[PDB]
Every structure is written in C-alpha cells, then in structure tokens.
Symmetry: C3
Subunit: 243 residues, 3 copies
C-alpha cells in the first residue's frame, strides 16, 4: 500500500534486554524511526536522569522505513510482549499512519504476532549534555554493595578508580587498579571526584546483560554518562548529574 | 491379620509430582483403591473443573488390595509428607478398616514412615464427559504467556493449532504448525474453535513434569479434556467447559 | 605505633559462612582476641541457646595480637560488609585502643577496605555445659522436614538414631542406621531420648555450609551440643536444653 516501517532483529532477546534496561526508568517513551535506525531520548519517571538509546539500521537483519515516524509506546506492555519470545526467536516490529505496532516472533513451527496500541506522547523538549572502561558486572556489583552503606557513592578517579560510601553501617572504599572481562582502562588528564545517587546508578546497571564492558564519562560539574555497547547495533547511555 | 491395602512405587517423586498436579485444585479428595489400581475423581474447589486420575496396578512394584477401599485424604497434608522424600526413595502406602494411612520412604541407611488420618468425605456424585498432541512445556508456556493479555484464551484448531488472547496490554496470536519433544500432531475432521478460562488451563499445567507430551481433546460445545500420561502407570485428565 | 590486632584468612567466604551461622541468633556479640586465636560466647536473642565459636591462631594465614582485646560488633553490619567480598578474596581484620575495626578484602586489581564502629557490650556472665556423627545436610533436611509436623522433635539414639515428630498434619519417624558424606557413626552406652525445639535446631543448621559432618552430643537431662568443624581453623557449637 503506502508507506511502512519494518525492522527485523535476529534475536528477540537483544530487544528483551534493551527493554529491561529502560522499563524501570520509563513507563512510556517514543521511538523515533528514520533511515538511520531507531532512537529514543527521555527523562526518567522522576525527571532526574536522561536515557538515550541508539540502534543503527545496519545492525538489523532487515530495516525498512519509508517515512520518518515516532511510536509512543507503553514500555510495560512492550516488556510483557517480549516475555513471550523464546531464546532463538527473531523479532520484527511493523507499523503501517500507525495506530498500532505489531511485534512478531518466528523461529521451526512457532509463529507469534502481537499487536499493541500506540500513543500519543508529547515531545520531550530535551538537551543532551573527558573516561574509564571497566567490567560491567564489576560496576554493577560495586554499586549494589555500596548501596548497603549509603544513598550516595563517591567516585574518585586517577590513573585506578575508587568508589566510596559511608553511613551507620560503616565506611566503605573500593579501589580498582588499572590493568568476559576484567580489564580496567582509564583516560584522564585532571583527576575527578564526584558524588552520585546510588539508586540511579543501580537502575542503570539493568543494562549489564547487554555489554561486558561499561563506559563511565566523568568530568567535573557536568553529568556523568554511563554507556553500554549493544553489539553490532548501537548503545544505551544514561546521564546523571552529580550532587 | 485381615485385610490390607499395600501399594509400592519405585520412585516417590512420581507421587510427589502427581500431588503437585492436583493439590492446588483440590484441598481434599478420595482415592478409590481396587484390584485394578487407584482412581480419583473430584470437582475442584470452585466446582468448575473435574480432575480424574488413573493409576494401574501393573505400574506399581507391589500392589495388594484385599478388599476395595476408599481413602479420603487431605492433599495438603499428603503433599507435606511427600516433601520429605528424597530423589531415589520409593514410596509405600498402607491402609489397615483404616482410620489412618501410612506412607513409607526407603532407599541405603534411611527409613521414614509417616502416618496420616483418613476422612470421611462424601461421594462426589459425578458424570465424566474428536485431538492434538503437543509438547507439554510449550502448552504450559503458551498458557502462561497469554494470561498476561486476558483471562480468556481462544483455541482454534485446523490441520496447526492457534492460541489467542486480547486485552488492554494488546492482542496476541500464537500459531503452531503440524510437524524432549517438539512434535505437534493433529487429529481433526471439522475445525473447532473454543474459548477457555486461562486461570484453569494454568492450573492444569502443574501436571507438566509428568509428561513431555500433552493431549488436548476438543470438540465443539463439550468440555475440553487435557491429558498427561504418567509413564508406565496411567494418566491424569482435567475437564473444562468452554465459555 | 603501639599495639595492634591483625588477623588474615585466606578466603573471605569462610568468614561469610561463620557470620551466616550466628547472625540470625545474635544481633550483637563480642569477639575475644588473644594469642591463641578468636573466641565468642553468647546467649541468643531470646536467651535460650548458647553459641560458642572457636577459631585457632594457627588457622590464620597471619595472626598478630599484641595485647588481648574484645571487639563488640553488630553482626548485621558485619554481615553486610562480608557480602561485599568475592569468592577468592582474602579477609583481614585489624583493630588499632579500638573504637573501630577494619575489614579488608584483597585478590588481582581490587582492594576493598571497610571500617565499622565497635561496641560497648557487657560481659555475658555465662557457664559452658557421652555422641553421633552424621551428614550435616541430612541433619538439616531432617530438621526442616519434621518442622512441618510439629514445633518439637524427639531424638532417640541407640547403636541407629531416630528423629520423630507428630501433630495435626500427622506423625513422622525418620530412622538412620549406622553405616560429601553419608556415614552415620554412633557412640553410646545407655540409649538416650530427648525432645528439642525445632525452631532452634533449624537455626543451628545455618552452620551447614561449614562442615559436611555434624556432631550431636546428647546425654540425658543436660543440654545437647551441636558441633560443626570449621576446616583447619576451629568449630562452632550450639547448646540447647531439652524440653
């Protein structure tokens, strides 16, 4: 007919994990689809952090976008649909204009199609705002652990990075020297020390299954950026202002 | 003395799984013991579905039943006893007449005997009421998934079977083509489509560990029968009227 | 400077498991440190059972204790610190006098130090009060299972040991004949039968990960002693009076 969006990923789990990385920060968001792929930018529910997702067209098995379109979606509903996909299902999203989007899983003997209504969301009015590379699971463990001591974590980087927290339980200091991964790589001129809200760092680490290395961009006075590479596809970035 | 019931199964886990398959639908039921084995027929707690269990005498390692007897049992208490059995324990049920039944696990160095009071339940006054064979775990997954969308699931069979649900979250369609298992086998003359209450199908799937294939008998206007083969022993069947 | 306590264990998990074994019985306790190692004796929160821990100096990779000292500690806070240790971290405890103690984990690229305030607890005023050796996991399973039937468990030992409980659910008897482990070894002159509170035995079995064999010392009229060997280091003992 005329005109359509259709994007096919080889593995549904990639999309399931992308949704896990944002669903607890955003109950709804808009996916902007264009020739170059899919992007999302939104303030979290509490309007503190900024979430920015980039998926490139060249990482899809099939990508067609006849005209630019934006799909406002309930992320909770989208998560429930992605829960229905098996381990080696692909996932196709199609939007006829739209009032709905369709999500399709295929493997073989099983074909599943799901149809979800589209919103209807306002444009966000946003501004998107140096670095240390280290294991994603180590960053996640450190943030989980230090949260036991305090709602704030001090990050102090030289060229090693130190994560600190203190409170009733006691005072904690975790020091990682510069060395699937265990490599800790640091790029710094002037040392930086900043304090961040643990509850937000811990939300960011829901992106952990997407990447074995995480990137922290931390200059003084300006938001930290936490970045997870999505293999052969793009990345998610979280922006968080220091205290 | 005179006279006794004694039935011995090689693996207690078989009985643990049988109890898992009925305990959440029936808080109490009567086991009718005779020369041909053990049977159970009962309406569920809400008096909607019918549960019918058949165990043949020739599947027990030892089966003795001097006279017919019926044992009214608290299934919750029986479940707690079976929780006490290890992986390669056998299980012997003995009833002297009934006032009690005894349940015994043996392996070796460990012998456990449990004694439970018998009821005292009324006879049920029941009437027991074409088919598609498919993986039990697939049926269970499909029913769990579709329950996210609705309290009702439409089952539409041709010769593939389609499971559908729609609601606020969206609309879902799952289509399985005719092909430990993955085989989907269909026996139909006239196509049938019926709608069932998800909460009941999901209770039936507690029988899943007993069988890798499940059987659905579905003619128009009459109750669906969901059947799990219990290896070298018998079967459990659940009966559910369509909407 | 002058003078210090410093004790280093090769594996932090040993200490994590020691804490698991006492934290639910004691919210705070005093560790008495001397030349011969570390000891702890305390009544539980309900003031029913007695917990007694012995760690020998010769089981530490490094042990220095310039003068005797006692460290009153919040066990819940100490547990939270030990949660921060990884699988092959060592653990060093240091006390300068304290007012605080420091706990340090090292592996390599990661160094963590934690600092916790010391109490300030009264001396306990205590008196420390035949035997059967058997698998720790079997003892734990038996106690968990029998708790379904009753708040009391009868232990009846000859030369096999029998564990019994009865109640609404039914009556239970578990008999272990004398034979990583499965060995059941019995040392008795006169047979003994005693009844114990299940909720306490079940608290004791939190020590299970420390030892594959457990020891029960049970003479008539006097407290049972339940003992778990801590490999190449010492033991924990729980004392419980019969009903």
């Amino acid at each position: 007919g005329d005109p359509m969006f259709e994007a096919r990923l080889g593995q549904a789990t990639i999309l399931k994990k992308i949704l896990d990385a944002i669903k607890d920060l955003l109950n709804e968001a808009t996916f902007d689809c264009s020739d170059s792929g899919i992007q999302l930018q939104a303030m979290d529910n509490s309007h503190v952090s900024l979430v920015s997702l980039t998926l490139r067209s060249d990482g899809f098995d099939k990508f067609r976008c006849d005209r630019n379109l934006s799909m406002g979606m309930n992320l909770g509903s989208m998560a429930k649909i992605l829960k229905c996909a098996n381990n080696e299902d692909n996932v196709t999203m199609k939007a006829q204009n739209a009032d709905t989007v369709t999500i399709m899983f295929e493997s073989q003997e099983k074909v599943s199609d799901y149809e979800m209504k589209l919103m209807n969301l306002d444009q966000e009015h946003l501004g998107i705002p140096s670095v240390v590379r280290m294991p994603a699971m180590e960053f996640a463990r450190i943030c989980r652990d230090l949260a036991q001591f305090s709602e704030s974590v001090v990050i102090c980087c030289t060229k090693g990075v130190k994560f600190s927290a203190s409170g009733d339980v006691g005072t904690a200091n975790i020091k990682l020297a510069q060395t699937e991964e265990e490599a800790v790589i640091i790029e710094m001129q002037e040392p930086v020390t900043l304090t961040f809200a643990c509850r937000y760092l811990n939300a960011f680490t829901k992106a952990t299954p997407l990447s074995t290395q995480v990137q922290l961009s931390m200059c003084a006075d300006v938001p930290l950026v936490v970045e997870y590479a999505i293999k052969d596809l793009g990345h998610i970035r979280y922006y968080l202002a220091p205290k």
